[PDB]
Design a protein around this ligand. Sequence first.
Ligand SMILES: OC[C@H]1O[C@H](O[C@H]2[C@H](O)[C@@H](O)[C@@H](O)O[C@@H]2CO)[C@H](O)[C@@H](O)[C@@H]1O
Lengths: 16, 549
Amino acid sequence: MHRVSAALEEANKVFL
Amino acid sequence: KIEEGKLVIWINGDKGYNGLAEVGKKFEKDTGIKVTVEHPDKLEEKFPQVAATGDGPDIIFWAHDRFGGYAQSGLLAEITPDKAFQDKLYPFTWDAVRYNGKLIAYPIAVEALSLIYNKDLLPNPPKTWEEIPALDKELKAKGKSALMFNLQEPYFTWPLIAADGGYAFKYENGKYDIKDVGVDNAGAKAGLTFLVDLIKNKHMNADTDYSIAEAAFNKGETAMTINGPWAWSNIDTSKVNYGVTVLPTFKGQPSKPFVGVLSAGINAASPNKELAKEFLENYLLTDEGLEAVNKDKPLGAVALKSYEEELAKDPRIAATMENAQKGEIMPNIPQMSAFWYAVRTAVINAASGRQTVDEALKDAQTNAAAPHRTCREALDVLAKTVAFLRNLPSFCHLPHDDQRRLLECCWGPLFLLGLAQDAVTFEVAEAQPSLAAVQWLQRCLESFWSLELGPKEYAYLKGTILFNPDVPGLRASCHIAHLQQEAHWALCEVLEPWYPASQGRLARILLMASTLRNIPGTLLVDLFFRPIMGDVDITELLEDMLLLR
Ligand SMILES: OC[C@H]1O[C@H](O[C@H]2[C@H](O)[C@@H](O)[C@@H](O)O[C@@H]2CO)[C@H](O)[C@@H](O)[C@@H]1O
């Protein structure tokens, strides 16, 4: 339920 | 499916459809073939819609400028007028209906915009646009206007735009250069700049349309107006002593109005091609035929030599011709549709103030000279967006009803945020979403490209948009709320190193994200997907990629 931040950054890598 | 034994005809609502209907009644009494004359709205775009499917009218009336496109699409049939019949019409009007060396429609009449003025009010109409503002200043003192015409159609404001140097497609060696568009040059800019200054100075309203202008003039509320021959009919029945004369001159140069040739085409999917030819050749295109129509609403200079020589004495027709000479014939190439839409958008955006003259003519020049590279980039972003959701356990572990629910009202903002970060400027060439909406979309999008966000900001922001607790009927609502709060806390820490400026950045990014949520999901489809895959259900398509349907 925590550290969703690190998850988002990793998941949105496809847009780099 | 276009019924056999019958003849359906479509014509613009401002023409003399009643006079035409009569010619149809005579035709129906002689042959026994029923003829229905209809005048749908947006006919200019409605015809091709149904024409493709195989239905629609048997005969279609409109200016030649559009027929070229219908021809390329294969929606028209090549007319077969024998030599003898061709000699009855002016060879000048035959070129207007000739595309790629084939006659694709019957020429009816030549129309051109002229200046109609109220003699009692303006015993002497102005010779230059420049002298109009001052003329309106005093007329207002008597509860009246100076000039009032339709601003919703670039057709009426074109004369002014092209007066100085504006133009559609450069013409050289009997050919049009589809890459040379002059809608954003020095000339065109000045013309449209003048029009806008007329509105700003309260000399003219921006919402002024055809109906408003016509009513205002026929009632004696405005001193002048700009219209074509078809408009002389309603003025007569009104207590107004008008006069048709040459259009004002802008910057010493005359106004160049686009000349059009009202033409009649035969649907390529009609089984009454013969019944059609017979009607347009032995009934309509005749002295009595064109008179009945003209009787209802003026056709200007008829293509039929015989009947033309009779009306040649009319001083009004002479004015229309004088103006036509100053102007040029409308191109009939397929791109004309893209042109008109691009110009229509520019003129309306500048008049309403949503854009500056330079900004408007900037997008038009780019759109007028149309790649679906935009859509293809939206598809990549969408797919990208699917990969983003397939990852991120936080979303995958949510109840499926919640997943479908968050998706139903977030794919919009999520998608737009994707286009932003993917750095893809769009070229909305829609040769019907409201201009206001489209304009609002890009403003928001350009707002993101100027703010230059980083990979972290985008990521954390997407989280703020995805996990929305306010979504009705949500099961893990409390958890989703805790997930959004985290992304919001992270979005702040990425902007914490501050002393002054980062403070106004958080509020900026946030409000920008909010404007994204207020964008019609419907609009998005029609602007980025529909043009490449027809009607589409994004919610449905997305639930398939994520196996939720
Ligand atoms: O406004 C763009 C529009 O201009 C022309 O349409 C004219 C038409 O030719 C006239 O006879 C009359 O009906 O007014 C119309 C404009 O309101 C072009 O023919 C059309 O393709 C173009 O979109």
